[PDB]
A paper describes a structure:
For example, in the yeast [name], these supercomplexes are composed of a CIII2 dimer flanked by one or two copies of CIV (CIII2CIV1/2).
We mixed the supercomplex and cyt. c at a ~ 1:12 ratio ( ~ 10 µM supercomplex) in a solution with an ionic strength of 20 mM and applied the sample to holey gold grids for analysis by cryo-EM. Analysis of the resulting three-dimensional (3D) maps showed a CIII2 dimer flanked by either one or two monomers of CIV, consistent with earlier observations. Combining the CIII2CIV2 and CIII2CIV1 particle images for refinement led to a map with a nominal resolution of 2.4 Å. However, in contrast to the earlier [name] supercomplex models, we identified a cardiolipin (CL) at a site previously modeled as two phosphatidylethanolamine (PE) lipid molecules, which is similar to the CL identified in Yarrowia lipolytica CIII247. As in our previous study performed at 150 mM KCl30, we detected an elongated density corresponding to cyt. c bound at different locations on the negatively charged p-side surface of the supercomplex, spanning between cyt. c1 on each CIII in CIII2 and CuA on CIV.
Author numbering:
A (entry chain L): 27 to 457
B (entry chain M), C (entry chain B): 17 to 368
D (entry chain N), E (entry chain C): 1 to 55
F (entry chain G): 2 to 127
Write the structure that this text describes.
Amino acid sequence: AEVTQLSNGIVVATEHNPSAHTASVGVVFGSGAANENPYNNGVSNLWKNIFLSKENSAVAAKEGLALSSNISRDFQSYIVSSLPGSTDKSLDFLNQSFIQQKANLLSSSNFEATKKSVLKQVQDFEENDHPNRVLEHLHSTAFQNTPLSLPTRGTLESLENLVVADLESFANNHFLNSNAVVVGTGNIKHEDLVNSIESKNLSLQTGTKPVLKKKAAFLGSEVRLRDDTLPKAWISLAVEGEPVNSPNYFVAKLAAQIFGSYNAFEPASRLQGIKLLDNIQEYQLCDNFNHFSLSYKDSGLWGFSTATRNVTMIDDLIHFTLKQWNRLTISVTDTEVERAKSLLKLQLGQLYESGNPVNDANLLGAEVLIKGSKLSLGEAFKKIDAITVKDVKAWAGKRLWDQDIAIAGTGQIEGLLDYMRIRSDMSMMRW
Amino acid sequence: LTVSARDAPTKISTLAVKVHGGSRYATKDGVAHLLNRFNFQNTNTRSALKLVRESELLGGTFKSTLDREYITLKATFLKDDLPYYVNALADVLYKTAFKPHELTESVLPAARYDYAVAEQCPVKSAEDQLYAITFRKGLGNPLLYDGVERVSLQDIKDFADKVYTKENLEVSGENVVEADLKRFVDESLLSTLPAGKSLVSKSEPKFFLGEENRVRFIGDSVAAIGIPVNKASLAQYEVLANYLTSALSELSGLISSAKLDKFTDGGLFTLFVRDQDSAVVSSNIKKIVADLKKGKDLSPAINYTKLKNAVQNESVSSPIELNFDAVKDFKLGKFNYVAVGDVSNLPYLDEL
Amino acid sequence: LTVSARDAPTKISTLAVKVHGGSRYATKDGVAHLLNRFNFQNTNTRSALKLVRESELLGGTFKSTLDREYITLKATFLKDDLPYYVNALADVLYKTAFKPHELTESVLPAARYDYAVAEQCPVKSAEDQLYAITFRKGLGNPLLYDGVERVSLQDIKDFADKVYTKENLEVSGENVVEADLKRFVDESLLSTLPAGKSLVSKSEPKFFLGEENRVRFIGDSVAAIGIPVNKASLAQYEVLANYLTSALSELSGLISSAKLDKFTDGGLFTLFVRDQDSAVVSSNIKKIVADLKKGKDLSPAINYTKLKNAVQNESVSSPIELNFDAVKDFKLGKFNYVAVGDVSNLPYLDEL
Amino acid sequence: MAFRKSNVYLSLVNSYIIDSPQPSSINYWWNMGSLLGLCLVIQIVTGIFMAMHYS
Amino acid sequence: MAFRKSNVYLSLVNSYIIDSPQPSSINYWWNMGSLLGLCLVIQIVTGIFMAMHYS
Amino acid sequence: PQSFTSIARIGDYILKSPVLSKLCVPVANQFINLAGYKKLGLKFDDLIAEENPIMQTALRRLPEDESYARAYRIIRAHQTELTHHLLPRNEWIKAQEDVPYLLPYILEAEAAAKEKDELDNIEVSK
Ligand code: HEM
Ligand code: HEM
Ligand code: HEM
Ligand SMILES: COc1c(O)c(C)c(C/C=C(/C)CC/C=C(\C)CC/C=C(\C)CC/C=C(\C)CC/C=C(\C)CCC=C(C)C)c(O)c1OC
Ligand SMILES: COc1c(O)c(C)c(C/C=C(\C)CC/C=C(\C)CC/C=C(\C)CC/C=C(\C)CC/C=C(\C)CCC=C(C)C)c(O)c1OC
C-alpha cells in the first residue's frame, strides 16, 4: 500500500485511503532534539511555534487549511490538512510560507511574541506536569553527556539566550533535500502528489547535515528531585533497550505487554491476567503503572512508570515488580506469551490503523527517514506470531538479568531506597 | 432494531450499541450514571472475571460511556472474532445479574471517583449550571451521581427494564461485513428483548433565557455564557464556534473554549473564559460580549468550518447534516450566564 | 466616643464596646471574621495567657462577637473590678501584637471550625444566599471566611486601623455607675485612639427584587423567601413575623422560622420551611405564598407583638422605638426565593 | 508486603540489622558495638567447651 | 499517655500482663501456661543453689 | 478444611436417595441434639471458624439485621458459658429456627475462588 518514489533528493511517500474524507500533506525532517547542543536547546521548539503563529495560521484558515507540527528526538514534521481536491493549495502554502520564504515569519514582534509564549509553556510544564517531567529526567540521567539526553521542549535557562540568528543557523544546517521526506496521507494518490511537486520547483537547500562526533551510550545512574509539598510520588525505572533497526525489536515490545498497564480505579483493570496484580492489591501499593519500550536511532529504554499515594511502602512496590521481571529469564509460561501476542496485535492495529491522517503522516514519514521504507501491518503480524518462549528467555537473560538501571523520581520519595538495594533485585540468589 | 455496517480491508473491527438512555431520560438523579457502571459486571451465565480473561486471549476490549442522550456499549477486537463479541454485548443488555454486593464493592466506589474528578474542574461545573438554567428538567438533569437523591438497587433494575428495549437501540459497526452482522444480530439474545417504545420525543424542548447563577470555588475563576439553538439555526452557530477559536478572530486569544453540542432536536452554544486572576476574567468577558453585540461576519470562516466538521464526522456514524452555504452574519441577543470562582470580583449579568 | 450606663443594686456588671466593623464593611471576604478571632490575643504589654489567668482570679470573662453590622467586645465581671476591664478592653483596640505565628496556630484553626459548623446547617446556607441576591455588595457580603479570597496578615492589620477609630465605636455598660465609667474611659488608652471617620452612611441600600438561586445539598431540604424593607415599613413586618409564628395563624404549623433583621437604614424579612421530605417542603411553601397573596389582617397581633418586642429589647441598650399602632393589613408583592437540598424536586419561582 | 516484614520473627531481624535507618556520617568509632557482640559470643562458646573438662 | 505505656520497658509488661485483652469465657484449663512458667523458675533457682555444692 | 462444596455434594446424594435418607437422617438428628449447642442459644452456622478469607467475605455480604442478631447470640453464649450454666429451657433454639442462613453466601464465595484458580492455570489449545 505504501508507495515510495525518489526525485532529485527528496523522497515522496503516500498511504492512499479512498474512504478517507480528508487529505494531508507535509514534510518530515530526519533531525530532531538529539541534534542540538546544551546551549541552543529549544531551537526546534521555537520553529514549531513560529510555523503555528497567529499571522501564519490566519492565512491558512482563509483557504480552509489546518496546520500541525511535532518535535521528537529524531524527527520533526510540518503538516497541512485540507479537504480532498484542495491538495494543490496545501502544497502551495507549504512552499511560499516555510520552504522558500522565512523572512516574514522571522520578523521582529513576531519572534519576540512567540518567544514570550514558549517561555511560559515550559515554565508550567516544569512545575505542573510531574509524570512527564520524570520521564524526561530519566533520559537526561541515562544518556548524560550524549546527544540522547536533551529535552525536546528545551530548557528555560537555554531559551532566554536564543535570538533570531540562531534559528537561521539551524534551518541552514538541517532543512535540506537530503534530510527530508514529503508525505501524503488520506485521500490522495501517489501519481497526483508527485506530479504536483514537479510542476513547481519545490526544492529545499543543497548542503548536507553535520554529523555527530559521539554516539549515545547508556549509563547506570539516578537523579532525585525530592519535593515534600507534592501529594504523591512519581518514579521511572528502565534498563537499556533496543534500537529501531534491531532483530529483537518486536520481542522487547512483546515483553512489555506481559506486564502491561494498570488503573486502580477501573473495575475491569483489576481483573487482568497479570500475576503482578495479586501482589500489589492486598495493600494498595500504587494508583497506576505502565510498561514501555522506547526505541531510537542509537539505543532505547525498557521499563515502567508509577505513581502512588502509599508513600510508606514504596520499597514493597519496587521489590515485587522487579521480582516478576526475573521470571522472564527462568520461568515465563506459554499462556503468558500467547496472551501478550493477542494484546500486542490489537495495540499495533489501533496505532497504525486509526482514523487520523495526521497521525499516519508522522508515523510513515519517520519510518522512511530511518530505513528507506515502511513495513506493512500484515508482515509485522507474521513476525509477532513467530515468537516463542525460548526467544523471550534469551532476550531477557541478555538485557535484564543482573544489569545496570536508571532511576528518576520526584515528590515524596524518601521511602525510595538507595541504588544498591534496588539493583540487587535484578537477580535471585535462589537460582 | 437498526443494523448498519461499513466494510474495509483492515485488521481491527469495532462494534457499538447505542441506547437512548442518557441522563436526559433518568427517572432519578444519577440513575443513568449508575447503570453505566454496572454494564460489564457478572451476568447470569458468565462472570466479569471470566469475560476479561477470555477476551484478552482473543484480542479484544470493552467499554461503556454515558452522555446526556446516549448510553454506548463498544467493543474493539480483531476482525475474525465477530460472533463472540455480538453475544457478549447481547448478554449484557439481557441478563445482567444485578447483585447486592456488586453495587457496594465495585459500582458505588467507581461512581465516587468519577464525581470527585469532575468536581475539581471549574469548567465542568459552569457547563452543568448552564444546562440546568436553560433546560430545567430535560437536558438539565445532572449527568453524574452525587448521592443527593437516594437510588436503590431496584431503581437501577427498573431503569434498565425501560431503556433496554428492541425499539430503543441501534447497532453499528466499522470494518464489519453488514450481511454477516445482520445474521449474528439475529439468532441472538438481542432478538428476544422486549419490544418497548422509543423514548425519543420529536418536539423542541422548553428553554429559558436571561438566567444567571453564581458558585463560590477555590481555584480558577470561570465566566461562561450559553445560548439555546433551534434545529434550523444549527449551522450558523457551528460556524461561529470555529470562527471564535481560530486565527481569523482577534477574540480567540481571550477565549479558553467554545463549542456547540448537537442533539436531534436542537443544541446549546457554550463559551468559556478561564484564568487564575479574577481581574483578567472580568475584563475579557466584557470585551467579548460587547464585540459580539455589534455583530460579526462569518463568511470568511465557512471553508475552514467545512474541513473541521469533516474531521469530527469521520469517527461518528450518524452526524447531523449541515449546509454552511447560507451563513452570512451574527448578532448576539439574549443569553444565560454563570460565574464560578471568586464571584465577589466577577461581573453580574446586568453589567455585561 | 459615646459613653453611657445604667446603675442597679446588683453584684454583676457588664461592659461592651461596639464597633461599626461588621462584614458589610469588609474590604476582603472574611477579613472581619479574622479580626474578630484575633481580638483577645497577645498585646504589646500583656500575653493572652496572662490575661486569662489574672482575670479568673478576679472573677471575669471576655468574649468577641461578629455580625453583619458590628464587632462587639464584651466583659462580664464583679462590680468592683470596673477599672481593670476598661484598660483591658482599651489595650485590645490599641496595641494588639498581630504575630505571624498566632495566625497559623490559633486564629486560622478557629475560623475553620466556625465555617465547618455553619456549612452543615441548610438554614444558614439559605439565609446567606438570600442576603447575596437581595443586596449584592455590602450587606450581601459573606459573613465567614472560607479561603476563596486570599487574606494575609497585612490585610487584617489594615482593616483594624480603619475600623478601630475614636469616631467609630460606642461604649456602654450595665449595672455601672455612669459618672465613674466616664472618668475611667477618659484616662485610659481609648482616649488616645486616632480620630478617624464614621463608616455608617445615612443613605438607603440598593436592593434587587425577583431573584432566585438553587443549591444542592445532602440532608434536609429548605425553601425560603426574602423581602427588603425600608424604614417606614419596619413596624408592619415586625407584626407579620410574630403573627405567622404564633398560634393566631393557621400557617404556623407549616413555617419553621420567620424573623425580621433590623438595621439603621432598613431591614430584611425572612421565612423558612424545612423538612426531611422534599414533597412536604414543596406543598407547604406553595400554600404559604398563595395565602399571603390574598392578604392578612395583622390587627389581632399588635398587643402580642408589643410584649415580644419588649422582651428582646430588654438587653439591647439602643433599640429603635417602633409604633405598631397603625398596622392594619398586609399583601404580598415581589420577593426573592432560594431552594436548598433536593432541588430536582422543589418548585421554581415562576410556579409560586 | 515482603515476607521479611510480615513474619513475627523475621520482622525483628529486619527492623534491627537490615532496614534500620542509619546516619550516613558515622565513622569507624561506631564499629565497637558490633565488636563487643562478637566478643561476648567468643567467651561463651569457648567457656562451655572448656567446662566439659574442668573440676 | 500513662507512664506504663510510654516507657520502653514498661510497655512490654503492660502489653503482655496488664492490658492484654482476654476472652471472657476461658476456663481453668487456661491456667496451665502460667504454672509452667513457675515450674521453670523453681527448677532454675533450686538448681543454681545446689550447683554451689556439686562435683 | 473440607470445602462446603464437598460437604453439600455428599450430603445431597444421601437426601435424594430414599433408602439412605431413612437410615442416615434419623441418626443425624440425634447427633445434633446430643451436641447441645442449641442449649446455649446458638445456631450451627455461628460455630463455623471465621479466620480465613472465604468466611471473611461471606460475613461482609451478610445483611445488617442478620449481622446484628448473630452478634447478640455470640455474646450471650460467652456469658452463659462463663457461669457454667445453661440457658432457661424456653430460651433454647428450636429445630425450625436452626436454618443455614450463612450457607448460600459461603457457597457463592467458594465458587468464585475456584474459578479464579482454574483461570490462572489455563492452557490454550490449538
Ligand atoms: C557487652 C557490652 C555492650 C554491647 C554489646 C553494646 C552494644 C552497642 C551497640 C551495637 C551499639 C550501636 C553501635 C555503636 O554505637 O557502635 C551501642 C551504642 C551505644 N552504647 Fe553500647 N554496648 C555495650 C556496652 C556499653 C557500655 C559499657 C556503655 C557505656 C557505659 C554503652 C553505651 C552506649 C551508647 C551511649 C551508645 C550510643 C552511642 C551513639 O550511638 O552515639 N554501651 N552499644
Ligand atoms: C563475658 C563472658 C566471660 C568472661 C569475660 C570470662 C572471663 C574469664 C577470665 C578472665 C578467666 C581467667 C582465665 C585465665 O586467666 O587464664 C576465665 C576462666 C574460666 N572461664 Fe570464663 N569468662 C566468661 C564466660 C565464661 C562462661 C560462659 C563459662 C562456662 C560456661 C566460662 C568458663 C570458664 C572456665 C572453665 C575458666 C577456667 C580457667 C581457664 O580455663 O582459663 N567462662 N573466664
Ligand atoms: C515451658 C513450656 C511452656 C510454657 C511456659 C508455655 C506457656 C504458655 C502460655 C503462658 C500460654 C498462654 C496461656 C495458656 O493458654 O495457658 C500458652 C498457650 C499455648 N501453648 Fe504453651 N507453653 C509451654 C509449652 C507448650 C507446649 C509443649 C505446647 C504444645 C506441644 C504448647 C502449645 C500451646 C498452645 C497451642 C497454646 C495456645 C492455646 C490456646 O490459647 O488455645 N505450649 N503457652
Ligand atoms: C552488625 O549488626 C549487629 C549484629 O549482627 C549483632 C549480632 C550484634 C550483637 C547483638 C547482640 C544482642 C548479641 C547477640 C548474642 C547474645 C545475646 C549472646 C550469644 C549467645 C550464645 C553464643 C549462646 C550459644 C551457645 C551454644 C550454641 C552452646 C554451644 C555448645 C554446643 C553446641 C554443645 C555441643 C552439642 C552436643 C549435643 C554435644 C550487634 O550489636 C550488631 O550491631 C547492631
Ligand atoms: C503473660 O502470661 C503469663 C505468661 O505468658 C507466663 C509465661 C507466665 C509464667 C512465667 C513467667 C512470666 C516467667 C517466665 C520465665 C522465664 C523467662 C525464665 C527465666 C529465668 C528466671 C526469671 C530465673 C533467673 C534467676 C536467677 C538468675 C537467680 C539465681 C540466683 C542468684 C543470682 C543468687 C546468688 C547470689 C549471690 C550473691 C551469690 C505467667 O505467669 C503469665 O501470667 C502473668
